[PDB]
Point group: C3
């Protein structure tokens, strides 16, 4: 909600209180989504000042407050900053911004990252360029310097983040994305590569000195319809865990596919059919094993811009003997959303 | 403070900076309230959109930021989300909401939960239905479908929350409250029962498979006067610790009583006299022992809606040989409040 | 940004998204500032209600959200409340406020605490009176009861805070500051002393029962120029660590000096030259050793009140054999700031 707009500066204060519960069977970790209460809230600000007609500055911070902890010592679990960055936008030369933000390959992966609750499975956090990272400098240009409507690109520089954990670290890397949109059609390509930190290299799973990820995207988004497809591959980047052994590291390679079809009824309903498969190849010891494999069916009802409800059902195709331990049970999720 | 109100949506952004200090003697844990600096702040949002004349959506999130930690590693201590839920309200059919919220038995207990700083001792957090819980679905109806002015009720479904700690877990349970108000008189009844988790059952104190709590309330709240009385009992639900032994668990039974009398002078002052006793019966090993027992005297001066000050004095009646280790010293608390 | 102003109450909701990166060499801890991504955000509220023409109430809370953590388990690192207090201001009698706030000696030290990114090195957090503390009651008077324009003073009472850590605890202490300003000239004196807690006394470095700190300040701040000098000394208060041995405690004495010169071009640029030295004397085992010693050069460009950029360069004078392990490398820091 735009709570401030004066003298060139305009501030948007935003957030949401999401009452959400997941249903599975088990103890719920042969399931996809797990099980039980998963309520949470979000708070953020989006600022934008007009330094002059050509020049704009902006900043953004967004936090996540879990809503299913007790008020004891574990109160904070799951709490974190998703985004925190500032930057400048100059006439048609481009925008530049620095901070904790979405990696460039997410430029592609975001196409199919639209289910009511699940989806976007290959867009992991703190994972080189596919999801939200820390320390990235991102240059983005639109319509090629104002000369070609609809043709955009970006380059992104990723700084080393030697973290406690091999799962959330990264060496320096570079990535870029090119994308073209026209009359409801959108096509994208993204690619980044990086150095892996020493601790990454010590993990029993995956061998290599460099982290690569790329992804392609195609989409039709007009006339209330939304059809979208992503296809991408990664070398030494996706984190995997062998639950039997408890070993962990990165998949040597992954081939990933995501398809999404949605329709927006004018009375509020948005049915969604989606399909996702991601499989790791040449896993030291295991061979070819699926990480993610499912059909998804779901609906969002929008009462208005502020209120909505949804159900998201994962028909999990992962099978039961999965040699990494990936759980095979469906999960259903029901949520009620207030946002401003 | 209502910072946003446009197009059917209205947002209230609220909070308080409470400078507060408690005085006891000791080392301050033969005391009631403990001792020293206890400053804190609160931040929350309350949203409400009008989907149409009969239908309303709403959400709420409220957080607690301790103000007496250092800026080292213990900085976060005491930090948590009190509330986080969203829901819908439909004409006279009722409201429904899901999330982290007040349990139904608090519907009664809130009557006497009005001291300047202390009080509400039996309304514990994460304790089945008496204080704020996680995972509750709550249906509330007012004036019996619009047919009986002043007669209200609610049912509440509580989902299992298998937490790390027996103190903050719960199995599934159900509760309800009925209440009638008329010309300043208010009467209430509340009751919930639940399954106890396995870990609850492993604790050395208390034996049983089910958690019950009920409470009754009576109140006169008109003409600047506030008189209120609560009486309730609980079976296997109230958490107790044996400080000598260090054992812990739930009281087999408790009988609880709370009385409150306050008066609101028109120039700002609100004297408060209150009395509270809560006693656990049949404690494995101990027998009948008081948990809470005191007189309270105190005053709030309201400079206006935004500013106020208060003193709260607990004349602790707990005696010195208390066989559970419950501390017996008075505590005095002085606070200065800014809220918006 | 003033988001609320009605009926005597006015609320300011404020914050900043700071994209910031430090450059050093090493592994970056022979450096001054360390090295890598150091992005963060800040959020706070400042409230003020008018109880009547003479009487005002106010409160403030400000938090710090790190922006360089991953979204794993270390997500919260560096997160804390800087300020949290409430108070009253009465006509010319004075203001009084209680809570987590700046200690009185910071009244002086703030003169030179103006570099773009570094500086204010002797203003430590949770360190008796020089930086932000918890539990202080502060009385401040301006223009001596309205009788002497420009002559101000304050007294401050500091309560014992027995914390886990000797570094962040304190016994009770008292401090005051007197200060005079006139036509761009400002002069200040501040002094506080305190008892040290038992755990403080157990540390291998520093011997004594009392913590003292004082500081003096001189400043010219008019006509776009800013020249400022601080000189202060402390007995048993400044925390020091012997990195070779890993011992830790407080410097027996320190003599501290800080000088700052800045100029504000009307087109936005603010060059800064600064110099800082702080040295501990009579260190059990070491003798006289510098803690802080450097030249600093830097610039801030202000696009407007909301946006700005800066570079801050520390020409570290600490030498390489420093007998406490204090690192000797320069650090450069580049930041981009959005604030509202």
């Amino acid at each position: 909600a735009e709570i401030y707009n004066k003298d060139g500066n305009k501030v948007d204060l935003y957030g949401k209180a999401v009452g959400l519960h997941y249903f599975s069977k088990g103890n719920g970790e042969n399931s996809y989504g797990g099980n039980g209460d998963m309520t949470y809230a979000r708070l953020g600000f989006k600022g934008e000042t007009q330094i002059n007609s050509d020049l704009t500055g902006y900043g953004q911070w967004e936090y996540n407050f879990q809503g299913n902890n007790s008020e004891g010592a574990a109160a904070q679990t799951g709490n974190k900053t998703r985004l925190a960055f500032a930057g400048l936008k100059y006439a048609d030369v481009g925008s530049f911004d620095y901070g904790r933000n979405y990696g460039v390959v997410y430029d592609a992966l975001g196409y199919t990252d639209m289910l009511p609750e699940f989806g976007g499975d290959t867009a992991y956090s703190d994972d080189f360029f596919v999801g939200r990272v820390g320390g990235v400098a991102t240059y983005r240009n639109s319509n090629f310097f104002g000369l070609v409507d609809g043709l955009n690109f970006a380059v992104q520089y990723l700084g080393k983040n030697e973290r406690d954990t091999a799962r959330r670290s990264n060496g320096d890397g570079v990535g870029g994305s090119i994308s073209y949109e026209y009359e409801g059609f959108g096509i994208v390509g993204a690619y980044g590569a990086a150095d892996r930190t020493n601790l990454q290299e010590a993990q029993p799973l995956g061998n290599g000195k460099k982290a690569e990820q790329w992804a392609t995207g195609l989409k039709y988004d007009a006339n209330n319809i939304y059809l979208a497809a992503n296809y991408g591959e990664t070398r030494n980047a996706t984190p995997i865990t062998n639950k039997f052994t408890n070993t962990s590291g990165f998949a040597n390679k992954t081939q990933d596919v995501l398809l999404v079809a949605q329709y927006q009824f004018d009375f509020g309903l948005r049915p969604s059919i989606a399909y996702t498969k991601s499989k790791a190849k040449d896993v030291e010891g295991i061979g070819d094993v699926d990480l993610v494999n499912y059909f998804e069916v779901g609906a969002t009802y929008y009462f208005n811009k502020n209120m909505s409800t949804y159900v998201d059902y994962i028909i999990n195709q992962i099978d039961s003997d999965n040699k990494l331990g990936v759980g095979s049970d469906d999960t259903v999720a029901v949520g009620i959303v207030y946002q401003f």
